[PDB]
C-alpha cells in the first residue's frame, strides 16, 4: 500500500504523532517519504545484516525481531512481519519507543534529508 501524502499525514495525526516528543507532524511525514516512499511494504536489507521494514523503516537489529539478524535486541517486543501492514499502528507504537530512547536521529533518512528543513511543507495543503 502506497499511502498518499495527506492520507499518511492524517493517519499520523489520528495515531498521536503530531508534536510527539516535540516533532511536528511534517517531520514524521517527511521521514516516510525518504525512508519508504510511503510504501507500507518496503523492506531494505542493510549493510550490517539487519533489515528495515515498513512505512518508517523500523530496524531489525534494535527494535523489531526477524530471526535472521545479528545483535537483535528486539526492544519493541514486536515481529518485523507485524510492521509490514497497511494500518500503521504497529509501526507508530514502535516509533514512539524509538523517538523516546536520540530523538528522530534514529532515522537516517530523517537526519540526512528532513532535519533542519521546512518539514511542515510536507503537510501544507492537507486539512
Amino acid at each position: 500500500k502506497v499511502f498518499g501524502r495527506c492520507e499518511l499525514a492524517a493517519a499520523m495525526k489520528r495515531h498521536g504523532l503530531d508534536n510527539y516528543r516535540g516533532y511536528s507532524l511534517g517531520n514524521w511525514v517527511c521521514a516516510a517519504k525518504f525512508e519508504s516512499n510511503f510504501n507500507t511494504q518496503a523492506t531494505n536489507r542493510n549493510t550490517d545484516g539487519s533489515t528495515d521494514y515498513g512505512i518508517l523503516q523500523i530496524n531489525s537489529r534494535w527494535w523489531c525481531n526477524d530471526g535472521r539478524t545479528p545483535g537483535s535486541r528486539n526492544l519493541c517486543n514486536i515481529p518485523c512481519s507485524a510492521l509490514l501492514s497497511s494500518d500503521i499502528t504497529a509501526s507508530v507504537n514502535c516509533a514512539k519507543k524509538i523517538v523516546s530512547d536520540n530523538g528522530m536521529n534514529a532515522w537516517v533518512a530523517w537526519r540526512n534529508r528532513c532535519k533542519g528543513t521546512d518539514v511542515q511543507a510536507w503537510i501544507r495543503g492537507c486539512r
Partner: nanobody
Amino acid sequence: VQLLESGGGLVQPGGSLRLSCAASGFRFDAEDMGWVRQAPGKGLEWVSSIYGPSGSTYYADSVKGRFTISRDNSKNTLYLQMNSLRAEDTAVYYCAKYTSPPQNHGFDYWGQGTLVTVS
C-alpha cells in the same frame, strides 16, 4: 574519523587474502564495525560484523567458516582474513561503521573500499 582499507589484489581460486582497516578518530576498542562488499553489479552485501567490548563476531551465510573478522586493538586496525576465495567473492570490500547508533540503515559510514579479484 578515518577508515583506510588495504591489502586487496589478484588471487587465484582457493587462495587467501587478509584485508586490513586502519581506524582513527574514534574509540576502536568498543565500536561496532563490519565488512560489507559490493560485487559487480549487485547491491552492497554484508559480510561480517564484530560488536562491542565483547567482540561478539557474526558472518553472512555465504562466508561462514571461510572468513575471520578480528580487531587488533593495539594498532586500532580491523582485520578480515579471507580464506578459500571463490569467484563469487570478487568485490570491493569496505570497512563500515555507524555514525550514531542506535539507528536504522545499518552501517552508514565506510572507508574507500579495497578491490579483491578471485580469478
